[PDB]
Design a protein around this ligand. Structure first.
Ligand SMILES: NC[C@@H]1O[C@H](O[C@H]2[C@@H](O)[C@H](O[C@@H]3[C@@H](O)[C@H](N)C[C@H](N)[C@H]3O[C@H]3O[C@H](CO)[C@@H](O)[C@H](O)[C@H]3N)O[C@@H]2CO)[C@H](N)[C@@H](O)[C@@H]1O
Ligand SMILES: NC[C@@H]1O[C@H](O[C@H]2[C@@H](O)[C@H](O[C@@H]3[C@@H](O)[C@H](N)C[C@H](N)[C@H]3O[C@H]3O[C@H](CO)[C@@H](O)[C@H](O)[C@H]3N)O[C@@H]2CO)[C@H](N)[C@@H](O)[C@@H]1O
Ligand SMILES: [K+]
Ligand SMILES: [K+]
Ligand SMILES: [K+]
Ligand SMILES: [K+]
Ligand SMILES: [K+]
Ligand SMILES: [Mg+2]
Ligand SMILES: [Mg+2]
Ligand SMILES: [Mg+2]
Ligand SMILES: [Mg+2]
Ligand SMILES: [Mg+2]
Ligand SMILES: [Mg+2]
Ligand SMILES: [Mg+2]
Ligand SMILES: [Mg+2]
Ligand SMILES: [Mg+2]
Ligand SMILES: [Mg+2]
Ligand SMILES: [Mg+2]
Ligand SMILES: [Mg+2]
Ligand SMILES: [Mg+2]
Ligand SMILES: [Mg+2]
Ligand SMILES: [Mg+2]
Ligand SMILES: [Mg+2]
Ligand SMILES: [Mg+2]
Ligand SMILES: [Mg+2]
Ligand SMILES: [Mg+2]
Ligand SMILES: [Mg+2]
Ligand SMILES: [Mg+2]
Ligand SMILES: [Mg+2]
Ligand SMILES: [Mg+2]
Ligand SMILES: [Mg+2]
Ligand SMILES: [Mg+2]
Ligand SMILES: [Mg+2]
Ligand SMILES: [Mg+2]
Ligand SMILES: [Mg+2]
Ligand SMILES: [Mg+2]
Ligand SMILES: [Mg+2]
Ligand SMILES: [Mg+2]
Ligand SMILES: [Mg+2]
Ligand SMILES: [Mg+2]
Ligand SMILES: [Mg+2]
Ligand SMILES: [Mg+2]
Ligand SMILES: [Mg+2]
Ligand SMILES: [Mg+2]
Ligand SMILES: [Mg+2]
Ligand SMILES: [Mg+2]
Ligand SMILES: [Mg+2]
Ligand SMILES: [Mg+2]
Ligand SMILES: [Mg+2]
Ligand SMILES: [Mg+2]
Ligand SMILES: [Mg+2]
Ligand SMILES: [Mg+2]
Ligand SMILES: [Mg+2]
Ligand SMILES: [Mg+2]
Ligand SMILES: [Mg+2]
Ligand SMILES: [Mg+2]
Ligand SMILES: [Mg+2]
Ligand SMILES: [Mg+2]
Ligand SMILES: [Mg+2]
Lengths: 88, 73, 101, 117
RNA sequence: GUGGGAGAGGGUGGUGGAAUUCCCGGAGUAGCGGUGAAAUGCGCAGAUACCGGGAGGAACGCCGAUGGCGAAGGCAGCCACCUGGUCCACCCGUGACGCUGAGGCGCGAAAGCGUGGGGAGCAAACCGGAUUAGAUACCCGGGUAGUCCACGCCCUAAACGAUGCGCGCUAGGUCUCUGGGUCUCCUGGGGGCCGAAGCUAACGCGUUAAGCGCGCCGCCUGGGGAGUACGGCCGCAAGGC
């Protein structure tokens, strides 16, 4: 699964300020954690499509968050990507 | 309509999740090996749901039977 | 690393030496699969509600352990090898849910 | 010529026939009867009277072995079940117990079209 | 975000008992089976019924329900690992980041197709027995594909609530599932029945709208011809759109 200590680790890594639990970056980064863990779950168990649903939904919400940030502050958007390593 | 007795009020403090406690799970099985319905047990939805699984757990172990023969018919 | 409960039902016909060997093998297999044993109940020979391996009795053991989850099904695998052992069932521990309280 | 004097009386009832198998306490059979052992041939074998005659002929066959006490075990739902019971119940044999061991699966096999739904 | 809840939601490995069939042994005799009645069939190479052992395939009785889960198809013995969705309390954080959605992509009961396994029971086709005026059937005895497994196809349906998705507004009573709380009761999510206003051609719907409103998609335009022909795209084919 995903332990609360890993969760705290990534939150605190991406928190804009101490106590930031809800920023765009914290969200995108959490979804990135879950997405990568689910993709690793789906290299095995490629016959489990009901989870694969949850995967498409996660990617979708992450793309909406990134499109939002892209609109509002392209600096933090590129910074986010450069940290997470997404878009390719 | 099971106006003879209800098994829960025929019992005191007990743990529904104890698969190893026979002398109580015994009380929830019928004269055959079958699991009693809520008419007799008087359990609730959640209660009968969990007791079911702990009885099945007990059946695998050989503590409760899967089926019995009917006597006296 | 989670908290489990190993149930073992083995042959009721074993004299003290062979059974002691089997318990030894249980301890050893645990040390090999990383089972920190928190407590143990030895219920011993006990009547079975149906014959298992044609024997109307079985010898019961129970271990509340803590071990890596990723190696649980491996461990059970090993425990099933001994002919003396006729039932293996591993279970995640749970908080007791009480009725008529 | 065994001199058993005590055994088990199996009853296999069905909607087509009723057949009695009388055994030693271990379960090995001594004698037996059914609707076809008596002169009944067609559908009459599935009668409570045919059952009665079958169980009586079984009990009388077993008297020749000097059997007194039996435990009865019924299997199958079908006419003549309870009539074979009552035939043995005062057949001369003493019925020590009646037990219904009719085999039921746990949803094992697919029945014929006849038995589906 | 935090902290708790519930579930046949999904994948993989492992595993438990009942039953059927078959094989072995024991005991035992003249039939069993089956039907409206029968016959075919099976049985003296010893069947049926009965006890003991063994093999294998499939399916999980009671629990179980007017119950739950899921987007749909659909999901039910148990254990473990991996994994999806959801609900509540707290008012903590982000600051309109929202809704819908042509095309696309993924999923998609059964049956059906390719390879390879498996094959107990059931069973299209087929072979018999009956019935009938006939009986290419309904009934009975057999039986191949198939039903099962891995992988790849196929893409349909009375795929049904015959009711697209989201959000706001509009009496209640009651049953139930699952939370929370000052736990007679209050409060949130889900499933039922009856009904206010209202709507409807009627049937009926009625806070789970088929009411009152807004947003976006899909679709209809008399019956037959016809889901046919042609063209195109897809498919191993059947065939699909
Ligand atoms: N999912 C399998 C089932 O899990 C049951 O237990 C399940 C639930 O009771 C339990 O609920 C958990 C829990 O942490 C708490 N109640 C809240 C939490 N959101 C839930 O976790 C949920 O969300 C996550 C993704 O975030 C999913 O991966 C997970 O499947 C889901 N249960 O999580 C478990 C896993 O889903 C039983 N073991 C059994 O019915 C069966 O194994
Ligand atoms: N075996 C448990 C289940 O197996 C599923 O798939 C399993 C089975 O479908 C498949 O066949 C197995 C195998 O041991 C071997 N080929 C033969 C064996 N009889 C089968 O096992 C099972 O078969 C069927 C279901 O198919 C069950 O009804 C039956 O209880 C069981 N014998 O083997 C797979 C595992 O190797 C899924 N993994 C999951 O649902 C679950 O773990
Ligand atoms: K056969
Ligand atoms: K079924
Ligand atoms: K339902
Ligand atoms: K409460
Ligand atoms: K109606
Ligand atoms: Mg969405
Ligand atoms: Mg073993
Ligand atoms: Mg007959
Ligand atoms: Mg499940
Ligand atoms: Mg033999
Ligand atoms: Mg012949
Ligand atoms: Mg001869
Ligand atoms: Mg011959
Ligand atoms: Mg047989
Ligand atoms: Mg046997
Ligand atoms: Mg075979
Ligand atoms: Mg039911
Ligand atoms: Mg739904
Ligand atoms: Mg629903
Ligand atoms: Mg349905
Ligand atoms: Mg606030
Ligand atoms: Mg602010
Ligand atoms: Mg959408
Ligand atoms: Mg589309
Ligand atoms: Mg399909
Ligand atoms: Mg199919
Ligand atoms: Mg095939
Ligand atoms: Mg094949
Ligand atoms: Mg073959
Ligand atoms: Mg064959
Ligand atoms: Mg057949
Ligand atoms: Mg047939
Ligand atoms: Mg014919
Ligand atoms: Mg006619
Ligand atoms: Mg073929
Ligand atoms: Mg449907
Ligand atoms: Mg419908
Ligand atoms: Mg409805
Ligand atoms: Mg519905
Ligand atoms: Mg609607
Ligand atoms: Mg629809
Ligand atoms: Mg939405
Ligand atoms: Mg409601
Ligand atoms: Mg429902
Ligand atoms: Mg109404
Ligand atoms: Mg009105
Ligand atoms: Mg009316
Ligand atoms: Mg509405
Ligand atoms: Mg159209
Ligand atoms: Mg249309
Ligand atoms: Mg026209
Ligand atoms: Mg048309
Ligand atoms: Mg068509
Ligand atoms: Mg064409
Ligand atoms: Mg082609
Ligand atoms: Mg055709
Ligand atoms: Mg063509």
């Amino acid at each position: 699964p995903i332990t609360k200590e890993e969760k705290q680790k990534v939150i605190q890594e991406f928190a804009r300020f101490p106590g930031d639990t809800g920023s765009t970056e914290v969200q995108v980064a959490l979804l990135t954690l879950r997405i990568n863990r689910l993709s690793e779950h789906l290299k095995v168990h490629k016959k489990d499509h009901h989870s694969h649903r949850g995967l498409l939904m996660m990617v979708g919400q992450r793309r909406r968050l990134l499109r939002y940030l892209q609109r509002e502050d392209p600096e933090r958007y590129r910074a986010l990507i450069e940290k997470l390593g997404i878009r390719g | 309509p099971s106006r003879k007795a209800k098994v829960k009020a025929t019992l005191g403090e007990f743990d529904l999740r104890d698969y190893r406690n026979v002398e109580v799970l015994k009380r929830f099985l019928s004269e055959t090996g079958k699991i009693l319905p809520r008419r007799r047990t008087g359990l609730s939805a959640k209660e009968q749901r969990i007791l079911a699984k702990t009885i099945k757990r007990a059946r695998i172990l050989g503590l409760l039977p899967f089926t019995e023969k009917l006597v006296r018919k | 690393m989670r908290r489990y409960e190993v149930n073992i039902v083995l042959n009721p016909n074993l004299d003290q030496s062979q059974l002691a060997l089997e318990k030894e093998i249980i301890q050893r297999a645990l040390e090999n699969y990383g089972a920190r044993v928190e407590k143990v109940e030895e219920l011993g020979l006990r009547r079975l509600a149906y014959p298992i391996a044609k024997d109307p009795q079985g010898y019961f053991l129970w271990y509340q352990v803590e071990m890596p989850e990723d190696r649980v099904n491996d461990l059970a695998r090993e425990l099933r090898i001994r002919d003396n052992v006729r039932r293996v069932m591993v279970v995640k521990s749970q908080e007791p849910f009480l009725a008529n309280a | 010529k065994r001199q058993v004097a005590s055994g088990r009386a199996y009853i296999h009832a069905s909607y087509n026939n009723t057949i009695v198998t009388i055994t030693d306490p271990d379960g090995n059979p001594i004698t037996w009867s059914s609707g076809g052992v008596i002169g009944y041939k067609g559908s009459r074998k599935g009668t409570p009277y045919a059952a009665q005659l079958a169980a009586l002929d079984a009990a009388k066959k077993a008297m020749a072995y000097g059997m007194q006490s039996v435990d009865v075990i019924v299997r199958g739902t079908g006419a003549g079940r309870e009539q074979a019971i009552r035939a043995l119940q005062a057949s001369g044999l003493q019925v020590k117990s009646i037990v219904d061991d009719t085999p039921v699966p746990h949803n094992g096999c697919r029945p014929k079209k006849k038995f589906r739904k």
